[PDB]
């Protein structure tokens, strides 16, 4: 067998950990965002609307 | 023998030249855009039109890069 | 690294790539479309994300009324690009025959295809200058999207091969968190481009 | 920062914002607390205050 | 031999083109939204859109390079 | 025999000049239509006789590259 | 032979690119913080993205000249 | 022998120059024409006479080209 | 033989860069200070970080040089 | 022999710093009478000795290329 | 052999460097010290630590270029 | 020998710094003839002992060019 | 035997290097002349030292020329 193989894929997991350290927080953040900004805009309508 | 390096310095000088070119027509419609953001689509196709002609001299060259490697 | 074809007329790899990536595209779509929601959550506020980002690039170029048509192309066309950018960096996995599964991005017949076939699309829904002009722009997107994915591909390979070897995890960590951006900037350029020559025939 | 629109009749608005932006003759044209002493003619065009989220408009004609 | 060389000058001039071109349009947009923050998501837009567009055709000369290396 | 690299610094070179020139040319148009756009197509026709001229020492550049790599 | 001579080449045209490409963005977010000093902190963050897209092919030059070296 | 490269370099080199101040003479037309549109006719005539002005050298360079080449 | 040659050309091409593009980022930031000079501090910490960037790319070069000058 | 590439080197580079500097004193002045018209004729003359000035030594460039053309 | 054209294209390519980088910061500090004429003591003390600054490594490029002439 | 094209190349590059300076000096004497045309002795003398200044080193280098030639 | 080109293109780097560099400093001292008259003698003593500095670093290059030449 390849040495090659292994050796990048353990590599690209544990770079998937240190891009999981650093980049759950703004994506996750960023749809969060997304979520909480329509919600408030249908809210206002509906308000406006009774 | 020669010619490889006869297509290189013809890919590498076409790929200098378009790369300021481009960055030149590119960095002024970005201050375009940012004095006046409304003028979009008309600074954005003279940009294309600008890319299309600073792009294609050096696309004919790099076309022509091929016929040196071979020989 | 050779190209492994078991047919004499086409790529046999490349086939399986453009399968399973037809396939991952396919099922993440209907796990994002599986049920009507009023209120977007999970996976539908994503997708709807991607549609208005879509649409947004579509109205960037040109009017809204004309762009509307192409927002389905649109969409498909970003994330099929976006996977087959994105599959390459994972596994690219080595046989004891030439070459197997690396990326269908990386083949350029597949990206000049996919090129030819767009501007193909945009002559069907829409003087030796104006089409000198035409297959450069076709030849330097198939170009653009071919050469910024391989080399990537390339380097990704000899730094696994350099690993292996014989320490160096995190210049390729840097240069894999590189190449998605890579992969999301071309994909990007790609379909904002494609909308750019649809509106430049449309309208 | 203090902005004050003025007019020859008399003041209009002046109170304290945030980050007042205006396009001016030239273009476009944003403006931060510290901004560098700078003169620019306006167009005929509202100017956008940004009082927290309320972006109070205010149409300057002539303008300066 | 000579095709090292050849490969050399390829992707330095391709990465010398990017570089003045990426600084250009680079420089001209944290200059504009210098100008003005209010638009800074729409010029790192076209930022990135320039930024592809200026380092398209110097990595062609870079997979061209790899090429001359392989003849 | 060495023609094939003649031509070919001659079209890399004919090449950078014509990607500056029309970096020039087209970035200042294109910043002429960005600061008032009622005549784009005065500032047009003039921007593509330029273009016209900066490419048109280039282009009997190459044709003296292809009259080069003949002998 | 011709590796070492190919490599320094390679790594000093990424050099002269990553050079001119930063020192003309940090001179333009320089001279925008001096314009305006409230917005340091988005310039500044704007200008380290732009170092970043800059040395983007200068570093793979780096790596393709070591290539070069070992050949 | 090498007259032919001789010839290239000449002809390569004076279209590099005449593209750049080409470029700069034209763009600087241009916005002249864009900020203020009544001079046309009169910047395009002194715009005329001084691409001539510019283009004049390389033209002697290339006929010395051609007796380099001849040689 | 080759290396030396080597190892100066990487010394040359990072020098120009490094002078050029100091050269943009110290003489912006002095102009900057003559517009606003009491924004000393904040001038001077960015273009010492923009320096250290601009410099840092050519340190590798010349230790790079350095490991060609021993090949 | 060699000299035949000396001299087309001379001229050629010649006619590069003859180009940028005639296109930067033709563009100014491009600006300069369209900016302030009624001044037109001393600032043309003294951008015609300006031309002579700029383009003298690209002319002793061109007779000592005659001169190692002879050699 | 070579390495004396190896020192001086050393000493050449920063000599070229510091030229460009010298002559950007003194010509901005002096339009500077042009502007706001009571600022001139702490322009001429950022200047010089700006021109010491950016030949910094031209000189250290100039006494590698020594022990290249050595080696 | 090669000496020949040594006095070129030492031509070749006087000219092309000779012609930039020149042209920068002289194309802002116009631009600054065009803001204010009432100081035209003071900038014209300004600019001729500049010429003097820029054209200096140049032809130190040429008369050096014809003591290279003769070796 | 290129111990002559060596001590050439040294001497013509160090013309373009300063070439450029007063260009750049005369360029703009002499548009601070023209903004405001009262301010010659400062600004033609900041001028005289940027050219001690912008011609210091060529004065070395071409007596470090004479060393290579005697080499």
């Known amino acids: 067998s390849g040495g090659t193989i292994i050796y990048q894929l353990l590599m690209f997991i544990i770079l998937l950990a240190l891009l999981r350290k650093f980049a759950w927080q703004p994506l996750m953040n960023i749809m969060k965002q997304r979520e909480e900004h329509i919600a408030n805009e249908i809210d206002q309508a509906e308000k406006r609307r009774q | 023998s020669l010619g490889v390096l006869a297509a290189a310095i013809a890919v590498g000088l076409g790929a200098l030249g378009a790369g300021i070119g481009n960055g030149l027509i590119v960095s002024r419609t970005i ?15 003279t940009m294309f039109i600008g890319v ?20 | 690294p050779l190209v492994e074809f078991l047919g004499l007329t086409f790529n ?10 037809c396939l991952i595209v396919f099922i993440i779509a209907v796990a994002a479309t599986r049920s009507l929601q009023l209120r977007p959550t999970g996976m539908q506020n994503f997708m709807e994300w991607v549609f208005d980002f879509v649409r947004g690039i579509i109205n960037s170029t040109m009017d809204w009324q004309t762009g509307g048509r192409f927002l389905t192309l649109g969409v498909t066309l970003i994330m099929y690009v976006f996977v087959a950018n994105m599959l390459g960096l994972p596994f690219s996995v080595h046989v004891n025959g030439e070459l197997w599964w690396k990326s269908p991005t990386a083949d350029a017949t597949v990206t000049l295809t996919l090129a030819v076939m767009v501007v193909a699309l945009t002559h069907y829904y ?14 330097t997107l198939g ?22 070897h014989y320490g160096a995890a995190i210049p390729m960590m840097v240069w894999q968190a590189f190449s998605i951006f890579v992969g999301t900037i071309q994909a990007f350029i790609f379909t904002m481009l494609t909308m750019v020559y649809m509106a430049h025939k449309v309208s | 920062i203090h902005v004050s629109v003025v007019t020859p009749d008399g003041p209009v608005y002046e109170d304290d914002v ?35 989220g309320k972006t109070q408009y205010i149409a300057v004609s002539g303008g300066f």
């Open chain 2, 52 to 71: 299309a002609l600073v792009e294609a001299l050096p696309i004919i060259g790099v076309v022509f890069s091929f016929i040196y490697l071979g020989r």
């Open chain 3, 126 to 139: 829409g003087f030796p200058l104006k089409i000198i002009e035409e297959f450069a722009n076709t030849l």
């Open chain 4, 18 to 52: 945030e980050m007042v932006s205006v396009k001016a003759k030239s273009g476009e044209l944003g403006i931060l607390p510290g901004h560098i002493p700078l003169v620019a003619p306006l167009e005929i065009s509202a100017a956008r205050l940004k009082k927290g």
């Open chain 3, 143 to 164: 170009l653009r999207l071919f050469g910024n994915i391989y080399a990537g591909e390339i380097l990704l390979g000899l730094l696994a091969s350099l690993g292996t």
């Open chain 2, 31 to 45: 201050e375009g855009i940012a004095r006046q953001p409304e003028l979009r689509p008309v600074l954005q196709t």
């Open chain 3, 12 to 21: 046999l790899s490349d086939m399986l790539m453009i399968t399973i990536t």
